[PDB]
Amino acid sequence: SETLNPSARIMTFYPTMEEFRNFSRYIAYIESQGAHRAGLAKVVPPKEWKPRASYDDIDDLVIPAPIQQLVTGQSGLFTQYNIQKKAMTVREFRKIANSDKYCTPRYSEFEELERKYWKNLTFNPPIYGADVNGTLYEKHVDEWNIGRLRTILDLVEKESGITIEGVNTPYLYFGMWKTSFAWHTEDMDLYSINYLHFGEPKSWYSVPPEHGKRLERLAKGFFPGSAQSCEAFLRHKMTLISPLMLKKYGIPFDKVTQEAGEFMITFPYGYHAGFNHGFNCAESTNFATRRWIEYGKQAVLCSCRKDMVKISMDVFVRKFQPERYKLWKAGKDNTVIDHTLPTPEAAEFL
Numbered sequence: 001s002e003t004l005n006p007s008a009r010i011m012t013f014y015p016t017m018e019e020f021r022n023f024s025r026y027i028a029y030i031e032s033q034g035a036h037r038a039g040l041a042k043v044v045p046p047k048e049w050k051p052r053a054s055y056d057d058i059d060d061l062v063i064p065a066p067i068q069q070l071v072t073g074q075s076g077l078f079t080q081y082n083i084q085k086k087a088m089t090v091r092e093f094r095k096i097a098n099s100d101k102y103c104t105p106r107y108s109e110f111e112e113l114e115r116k117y118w119k120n121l122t123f124n125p126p127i128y129g130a131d132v133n134g135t136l137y138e139k140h141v142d143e144w145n146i147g148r149l150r151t152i153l154d155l156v157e158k159e160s161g162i163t164i165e166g167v168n169t170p171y172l173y174f175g176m177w178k179t180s181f182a183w184h185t186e187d188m189d190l191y192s193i194n195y196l197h198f199g200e201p202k203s204w205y206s207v208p209p210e211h212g213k214r215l216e217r218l219a220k221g222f223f224p225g226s227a228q229s230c231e232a233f234l235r236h237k238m239t240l241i242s243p244l245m246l247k248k249y250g251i252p253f254d255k256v257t258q259e260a261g262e263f264m265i266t267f268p269y270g271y272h273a274g275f276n277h278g279f280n281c282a283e284s285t286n287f288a289t290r291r292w293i294e295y296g297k298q299a300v301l302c303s304c305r306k307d308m309v310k311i312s313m314d315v316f317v318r319k320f321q322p323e324r325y326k327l328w329k330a331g332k333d334n335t336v337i338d339h340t341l342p343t344p345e346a347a348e349f350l
């Protein structure tokens, strides 16, 4: 376990069509290769795979709650404030995104675009067509369908009827240049799948789950007010920290750029952040493996906010940890998580 991906670098996978067909099995496989150690992995689907025939019929799709992203800060430390704007179609969004005021600046290397992002982050607040309920997958697509992955996370809706928008349902994200996703782990420290349907790239930063607590200590020191009001303030998804600040305080991290037609997998307790290069569309949801259950049980949740995502772990412990159920209910389950260990389903690849 502590022998596979010892550098904990972001890994990229190129599955065959046969490998790609079984979603859960392929997650088990990439974990047997140590992909989870970085907290983030890229999966390039087979060349002949397409989730939709064309994206020429979606300009009339409504973005019910577009978000203007106001960013305040200096010296690589920032807080993002969301200003909800009026409903707009993808049509109206693509116009504003590709306009002279909001379009991508001219650049050669990614390092130049990255530098311009961290330099101009607080100027000309962009609009993010975020958290749009829906899928762009065609009903017949059975491989990696974000709308129906069929992992154990389905036990939440199957047993309780509870649907959590974007968590056990898909979300669509219409981006423009300089739109950001702040430093965070998933709700309940779950996995996530992200597919870039079309457009300009999405760049990502990732902190290995092995070093997540170090990132939290750093953030707590930089925003002591926030940390005092809520232990899990990073779950508010308002905190932006430049890679130079991470480098300066010895926090290990890696970076990757996701192109259209590529998937990104985030792993339990994997801190990630990033930005969009220009106009694009991404689809995402959360998912689980048997390895996630312990992460769900130990997840430090946001106290201070109402409507914060909290999944009852009871059904998972009863079904997959019956021998530890009574101990866990009594608050005596003292299991320590080994972030290097792959999911039990990977046993066949080890």
Ligand SMILES: O=C(O)c1ccnc(-c2cc[nH]n2)c1
Residues within 6 Å of the ligand: 130, 173, 180, 181, 186, 187, 192, 194, 202, 282
């Ligand atoms: O907006 C995005 O590009 C994006 C990327 C990575 N993660 C999330 C997220 C939001 C809630 N959970 N994960 C959103």
Ligand SMILES: [Cl-]
Residues within 6 Å of the ligand: 216, 231, 232, 233, 234, 235
């Ligand atoms: Cl936090």
Ligand code: NI
Residues within 6 Å of the ligand: 184, 185, 186, 192, 266, 272
């Ligand atoms: Ni995320």
Ligand SMILES: [Zn+2]
Residues within 6 Å of the ligand: 229, 230, 232, 233, 236, 302, 303, 304, 305
């Ligand atoms: Zn909070």
